[PDB]
């Protein structure tokens, strides 16, 4: 593959093999009291600062130099320009990749097929703004003359995870907005338990799907429309309670949605990069279009940072390169994202798609099979909860796990004169300090003796109380989790993912891996009808189906 | 380490190095149409069936025999009996391990220090039953005479994840129960946004903590109590709105809760094994004590299955051994848990603690450092959602990821004459089939030809459409997700975790790895007050603190 043949990558791998056992964080910090200043970036967005402290990583100045040289050798800057200039860098599908245009507040022209896309981008934004003002003010009325109290987004994957994550993260900014609900699973309990809590007269359904053919979403949509029409009866009332977010006007029309109720986006908006488009309507209804615009503006700021900053001081580039170091030299399978913020509780789940569906790939641009690792498994839970669930393994298991710890300095809820947030910050700081420093046999022994342990209780317990440490982390600290700041943070990780894919020579913007499961499900669906045994598959699929048919009738 | 020296383990590794390439699922199924029968288990619990289909794994009959021989050599059965008989198998803390006693419906004596624990277990269970009856019926009144409409569990980790996951999973059984809320994070957002939706006069707070000293929980509990007393003003009203679930009577009383309002458990109940104890009180309040007893009864059924079934057909043993194979021979770092059930959306998060905190260890019983892998990173999201988020990487990334796919045959919400559940079942089946079979270059070339692609376009796209497959899965199908069935399934995984830990020679039941972070946070807390710069830690900790202090005033 490209990367394995690259001379700067080989230089990196060789340095790693020779100097690996020289990378100990305790000794690195004891030896260089300027390590924080040299291995961190402080960004002023003018709407909050962002400190990206990457100094608790297993790197030296030489390692960072070699990584930046790898980015240059792999052509990261030229690929970036291709994206921003509207070239068809999604080469398997022959499409541009222009989520950056969706938030291009500067309205600099971006040409696709020789045509500036920004007028169309701004036309839809204007339509979203109008619609949100009317719904939130109460001017948009239901079929019995009532204001909308509940907005229900029906969509899955990229049509769900983004808006859900953002409305959870920005819940303090939703005063005066309708309640927002997210229905995504085809599993009928999802729509069933939602609809049981809603009044058809004051519920607005948003049907979100790029192609508008996804079975889960269309089936949920028909179930909601049947439920609505059982109450309203009048088919003309659907135009007051159903809108669609999509690129497929025909399928939206055939589903029965008023064409004036379609909020359009384009084929160069990837689903996992789509919350910035019409797909974000549920965000703008919930927290208002002004806050949605702030969210776009934060992403736009980080877009310009990525575009204008020399690589050695460029935040998404450095984050991407530290990942390459741990993925392709240290061999770490996973990457944990640990926001110390309850409002960010769906942030890790969002970048499970954003990261893993982008870079969970194995074919390069030349059609060649990679001979190296690509994207990691992303996971995580908010702090401090994770400390009492799985940090045991991070501290004392047998896995190397690069971790990003994130926290806002200022809380949305400064209760008890800031006591809760002070403890939260103390734990945020302590855990990365603990992961780095550990605790030696000698230090553990002195503690046990001071505690009063007998020589026999001490010797039995001692080895279990040792922390080997040397476990690397990023600490990402920002002034406050505002709409703007969330936009900048999400964009920062979007460009991290971009840079890694360019280095790996893969396509971060296609997803051919979802097709096989969809084909096979289409063939099994009809076979579940009737009680006849199935013999048309492998023995396991047959046996599972036939067990399902046996127990479908059992009375528990 | 014990495992590395084990002759059966070394035999496993040798076979792996020599016959790895024989393990292709497409060929194995084509060569043995009885593969499903040979590598699956059916369990009749009398309250539903459980099909544990492990045939889509990279195993042969020889591999399973070698794996079962490993469990024999490592003494799994003798360790099991030590657990069930009340011996102090949590050897670093000198404690028994008796979550199986909490659900011992047979009331067979289980002795700790020569004294039966079941009379006390059943005394607490009886107290839980009476309390749930009084709260749920409205006979227990708040300080202004209203019935309780909201129960708020305040706790973290083991005192949070289990009860939350079970009340989410059993929501259909909660008619007639109060709403339940879970406050766990110290982050003031969590308690603040909960309290804003509640009325002190009809809210019952459950302060859940084994030691009753966990800082997040005691801080949250004091904040809730201050909020409550701002409305009630009368300290005597606390006795009507605050109860404690704990082992520490002294600290519960110092917090100001009536001893009569304390539901006790015992030191041999691990936090991540504690939903079966008084810690489960919010479950019983929400779905009723009868449904809580069914939950316990299902775990009890699985306990007996684990105890009496030969290893070669013993569900948790087989799941454990399969994981050993992927962890210690193939080197897989993670284990994905994928319930095709929206009600189970917190199931994977629960076993993040249950698995990772139990087996995320590196010191053996003999005090020696392991020289092999131990517990995996557990993760997952409900299907079908995950298909549209990260399955791309499972199908076409560069990682080998063992997955457990779970689903109930019968849905709690058979809307549209079962259409939604039919589609869900079809995806559940299709995804493991796709993971196993993949799609070859020739198979994908044919699809592209039929799609009308130019020869140039076809050749460009073809390798991107290939699925290498041979990706193993477990499929766990059960009749219906009832309280009983949930208990059986959770107990199954508890015993899987037990077996793996014994094989690794680690202590599944301590958690010394949480102490360091607690110590260092205690040191940092008072340094955060004031605008004075901190320079007493490493340069990063100092720089982070000083940035926090700088940005604390920014507007
Ligand atoms: C998951 C999904 C895919 C697509 O339509 O492209 C959707 O938005 O429905
Ligand atoms: C996480 C925890 C630990 C303990 O109290 O032992 C708790 O239940 O509060």
Curated annotation (Swiss-Prot), chain A:
Pfam families: PGI. Strongly inhibited by erythrose 4-phosphate. The gene is GPI. The modification N6-malonyllysine is found at residue 453. Changing residue 194 to I: In CNSHA4; GPI Bari and Mola. Pathway: Carbohydrate degradation; glycolysis; D-glyceraldehyde 3-phosphate and glycerone phosphate from D-glucose: step 2/4. Belongs to the GPI family. It is linked to Anemia, congenital, non-spherocytic hemolytic, 4: An autosomal recessive form of anemia in which there is no abnormal hemoglobin or spherocytosis. It is caused by glucose phosphate isomerase deficiency. The modification N6-succinyllysine is found at residue 453. Its EC number is 5.3.1.9. HAMAP family: G6P_isomerase. Phosphorylation at Ser-184 by CK2 has been shown to decrease enzymatic activity and may contribute to secretion by a non-classical secretory pathway. Keywords: Acetylation, Cytokine, Cytoplasm, Disease variant, Gluconeogenesis, Glycolysis, Growth factor, Hereditary hemolytic anemia, Hydroxylation, Isomerase, Phosphoprotein, Secreted, Ubl conjugation. One of its GO terms (molecular function) is monosaccharide binding. This is Glucose-6-phosphate isomerase.
